[PDB]
């Protein structure tokens, strides 16, 4: 049942970001750019931002 | 500035004009002709039986039993109303079949259907021409073309009727203006809006010279073929059929299905590159309901009848020639038009000073003819609105239905009546 939930979440992502309209290669281009930017932000956060905030967030989630 | 007291008394004092000015009692257009029945050949006008020389029904397809049966079958299938625009559940299969039939009939890639004969050209012109463009339109063009040119805000430059030296002069002057400012010249579009057979005058345009001018001065061409669509050429494809001009040269060809095909509507045909823009930028298309199915089916059946035998065009041509030849020699009137033209005009040779007296003379002639069983009509114009107002004139319309004897009687009746009244 979790797979149906995740497919629905992806469908909502497509509806919100207007990727529903676009052809599959355009979707792949957008997703690649998004994950590249996410990785860049993660690396920059690792270089400078303290991990203490991450530990606090993990404790709050747990 | 102004006090509240001053503004209140200003609002109190103001008295606006009446909504509509008073109309004189003796206005000819105020009285309407009541046709008791269909406006067919041998009709009844004002209670008097008359032979119809006034209605634009060239091929006699108005009361053809095949056309009526086709329209009745379509009415039984769909009904009378479309109940929506072409965008919103108002596109039927008959509309697509009719568009395809017109595209195949005119040897053209695409055609588009408007639901009213005025709106087709009055919405075709504003779509392609915007503010800042140059338009070279003929002096003697119908009201629909003028309103289409007014709806767009381009620059309109009239030229003399069927004068190609004057179009050369205008296009050369615009060439100099282009040389002065190349930056604007690169973004200014030139159009030439002409008509195949002119309703006002009754003459025909010189397409060969117009096409050479298009290819010399890079100015596109729009053609209106209201009268010449179903009457000119061997297979009745218009004036491009008449001259032999390749239809690809003409960029847009607009006509109305109301004269020859005898069903309400209009259409515009051209390449897909040109036509497809009208489906979104055509106001008469996007913002109005579609053609009722029965009218579209009647148009399709009329197209079938025209395609089955093209001899009716030849018989119409010979009838026009014969009546035009017989109408020559009136003592007080003169014929304005060409032999090949179905609908031409009779105008006074020596016109009195006032236009109202000329209209009164022509209407007395029309009434005296109508008492003798010939239903003539007089061309009706808006005096104030028209850019170039033609002289008052009686309209003569010829049909494949009117036999030779009826044409001879009409000619002799007009001769007697005009020579009596002008005496």
């Amino acid at each position: 049942r979790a797979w149906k939930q995740m497919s629905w979440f992806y469908y909502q992502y497509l509806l919100v970001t207007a990727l529903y309209m676009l052809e599959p290669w355009e979707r792949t281009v957008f997703n690649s750019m998004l994950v590249s930017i996410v990785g860049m932000a993660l690396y920059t956060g690792y270089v400078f931002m303290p991990q203490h905030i991450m530990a606090i967030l993990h404790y709050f989630e747990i | 500035d102004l006090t509240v007291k001053e503004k209140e008394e200003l609002i109190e004092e103001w008295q606006p004009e009446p909504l509509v000015p008073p109309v004189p009692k003796d206005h000819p257009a105020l009285n309407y002709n009541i046709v008791s029945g269909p406006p067919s050949h041998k009709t009844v006008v004002n209670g008097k039986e008359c032979i119809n020389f006034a209605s634009f029904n060239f091929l006699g397809l108005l009361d053809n039993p095949r056309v009526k049966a086709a329209a009745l079958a379509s009415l039984k299938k769909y009904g009378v109303g479309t109940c929506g625009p072409r965008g919103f559940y108002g596109t039927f299969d008959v509309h697509l079949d009719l568009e395809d039939r017109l595209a195949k009939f005119m040897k053209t890639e695409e055609a588009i259907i408007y639901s009213y004969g005025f709106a087709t050209i009055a919405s075709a012109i504003p779509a392609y021409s915007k503010r800042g463009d140059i338009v070279f339109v003929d002096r003697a063009a119908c009201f629909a073309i003028q309103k289409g040119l007014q709806a767009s805000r381009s620059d309109i430059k009239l030229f003399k009727h069927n004068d190609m030296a004057d179009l050369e002069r205008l296009l050369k002057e615009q060439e100099i203006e282009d040389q002065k400012n190349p930056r604007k010249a690169r973004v200014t579009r030139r159009f030439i809006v002409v008509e195949g057979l002119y309703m006002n005058t009754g003459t025909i345009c010189p397409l060969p010279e117009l096409v050479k001018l298009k290819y010399k001065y890079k100015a596109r061409i729009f053609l209106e073929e209201s009268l010449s669509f179903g009457v000119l050429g061997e297979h009745g494809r218009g004036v491009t059929e008449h001259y032999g001009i390749n239809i690809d040269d003409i960029d847009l060809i607009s006509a109305n299905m109301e004269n020859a095909l005898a069903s309400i509507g209009g259409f515009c045909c051209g390449r897909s590159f040109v036509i497809d823009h009208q489906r979104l930028s055509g106001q008469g298309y996007c913002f109005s309901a579609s053609l009722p199915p029965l009218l579209a089916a009647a148009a399709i059946e009329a197209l079938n009848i025209m395609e089955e035998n093209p001899g009716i065009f030849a018989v119409l041509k010979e009838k026009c020639g014969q009546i035009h030849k017989a109408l020559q020699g009136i003592s007080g009137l003169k014929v304005v038009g060409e032999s090949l033209s179905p609908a031409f005009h009779l105008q006074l040779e020596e016109s009195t000073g006032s236009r109202e007296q000329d209209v009164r003379l022509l209407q007395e002639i029309v009434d005296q003819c109508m008492n003798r069983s010939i239903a003539l009509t007089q061309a009706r114009y808006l005096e104030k609105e028209e850019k170039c107002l033609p002289p008052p004139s009686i309209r003569v319309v010829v049909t494949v239905e009117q036999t030779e004897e009826e044409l001879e009687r009409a000619a002799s009746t007009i001769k007697e009546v005009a020579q009596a009244v002008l005496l």
């Binding site: 919100v16 | 709806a151 069903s263």
Partner: protein, 492 residues
């Protein structure tokens, strides 16, 4: 301006998050449109577009690229929701020809199959006079057999028939005005008869959300045009005061006339005009009123006479009453009603009366029979039942959708129900998801409506029965859960 019965309307505002996501979606589409345009220009990808012929390459380009930007990159992606062909009478249930595309909506191929029994909510038959059987159809068939289809000349010359006179006097008795005139097209009615009434030196106070025909009619005449906010009567009063006090723009001369262009029901918004306040203002400031009643002439009022009967007012107060037969009576046409002098002036000085062809004789008989049915001439009780059923349908549908959690615009009595989607992808998604479940709806977007407010408009009818409405409500509820379309913070 006094309302004898309450005037309850609601226009709930766009939530902040939904507006932000709408802007993000439009931005993504804009960037990918720029990318596709760049690829197409450099021929890296083949173009499914027509090109100007090689003999016309050195001509000035007919279309400026930026002009068609919205159409190629945004409208084309969801073009399948519009121009859907039908092959049946547009009753409660319609037959849609099935079509498919293999190059992403650039060209459509018709598959053999036909979708049967589609619940229809895009057609305008409020009173359910769109049927292929009935007394209207028999009368139209008889007139088609006798008079033929289409007339071949203008009204002034030979195209004036006895049917036209019968229809005009019938309309005059219908509305309650002294005289009326009929035209072959409502768009033509507006665009040809607004320029006759006013000219240069007259002011036209137009609504914000007026139809394209009214705007075109105002543009064709030389009158100065000013715009007031949609049903903001304080704004109308301010513009009236300023126009009367100051005068013409360059030379501060008084105006010749002031004409107020309004509508009965605004189709997109679904809001009924505040007519009593407009009449109070026009009586206080000596203005003229042009009331367009395309959507309200059949739907609204206890006996289907329009807004002037819905509010209980007097038809003599309104100077010009335009109207269209396409919506309710089921036949194409248009009309203007007013006093005798106005109608005589229009009969003499109207563009369509001089240059345009009359109505078709088969259509005028359908109109005549529909009107005689509505106002009780036929002897049957179809006129009362149709209006009562339409009112009940409107109440039921609007109540049920509002208590599901959707955002609905407009007055609670208007039969047009605009549901709000707010997002560009959901415009296509809603249409496709509805059609999969055998409901046809009209989704409109950026050109007809503002950029943020995207809506699906349901046009209810007296043809829809309670079972059709219940089925439609179930399917709309399920699709709303699917697409997360319940943006209402008030009720659920």
């Amino acid at each position: 301006g006094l309302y004898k019965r309450p005037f309850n309307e609601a226009f709930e505002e766009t939530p902040m998050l939904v507006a932000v996501l709408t802007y993000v979606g439009y931005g993504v589409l804009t960037l990918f449109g720029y990318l596709r345009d760049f690829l197409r220009y450099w021929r890296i990808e083949k173009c499914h577009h027509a090109t100007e012929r090689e003999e016309q390459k050195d001509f000035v380009s007919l279309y400026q690229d930026f002009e068609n930007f919205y159409t190629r990159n945004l409208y084309m992606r969801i073009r399948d929701n519009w121009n859907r062909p039908i092959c049946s009478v547009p009753g409660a249930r319609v037959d849609i020809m099935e079509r498919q595309s293999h190059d992403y909506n650039w060209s459509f191929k018709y598959t053999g199959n036909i979708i049967k029994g589609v619940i229809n909510m895009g057609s305008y038959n409020y009173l359910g006079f769109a049927r292929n059987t009935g007394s209207c159809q028999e009368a139209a068939a008889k007139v088609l057999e006798e008079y033929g289809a289409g007339v071949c000349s203008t009204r002034q010359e030979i195209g004036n028939l006895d049917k036209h006179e019968e229809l005009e006097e019938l309309v005059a008795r219908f509305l309650g005005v002294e005289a009326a005139m009929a035209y072959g097209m409502g768009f033509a009615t507006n665009s040809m008869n607004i320029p006759a009434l006013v000219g240069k030196g007259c002011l036209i106070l137009s609504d914000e959300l007026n139809h394209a025909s009214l705007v075109l009619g105002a543009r064709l005449s030389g009158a100065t045009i000013r715009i007031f906010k949609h049903n903001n009567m304080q704004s109308l009063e301010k513009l009236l005061k300023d126009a009367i006090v100051y005068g013409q723009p360059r030379t501060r001369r008084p105006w010749k006339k002031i004409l107020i262009l309004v509508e009965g029901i605004y189709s997109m918004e679904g809001s009924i005009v505040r007519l009593p306040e407009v009449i109070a203002l026009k009586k206080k400031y000596k203005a003229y009123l042009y009331l367009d009643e395309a959507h309200s002439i059949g739907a609204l009022g206890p006996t289907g006479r329009g807004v002037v009967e819905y509010f209980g007012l007097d038809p003599e107060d309104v100077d010009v009453m335009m109207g269209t037969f396409t919506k309710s009576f089921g036949a194409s046409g248009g009309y203007i009603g007013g006093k005798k002098e106005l109608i005589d002036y229009l009969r003499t000085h109207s563009h369509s009366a001089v240059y345009a062809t009359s109505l078709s004789p088969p259509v005028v008989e359908q109109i005549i029979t529909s009107m005689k049915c509505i106002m009780g001439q036929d002897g049957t009780s179809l006129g009362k039942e149709c209006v009562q059923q339409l009112a009940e349908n409107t109440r039921y549908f609007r109540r049920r959708l509002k208590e599901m959690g959707f955002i609905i615009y407009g007055n609670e009595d208007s039969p047009v129900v605009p549901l709000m989607l707010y997002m560009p992808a959901k415009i296509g998604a809603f249409g496709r998801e509805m059609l999969k479940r055998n409901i046809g709806v009209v989704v409109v977007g950026f050109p007809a409506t503002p950029i943020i407010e995207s809506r699906a408009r349901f046009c209810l009818s007296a043809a829809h029965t309670k079972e059709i409405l219940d089925t439609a409500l179930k399917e709309i509820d399920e699709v709303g859960d699917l697409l997360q379309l319940k943006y209402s913070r008030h009720r659920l």
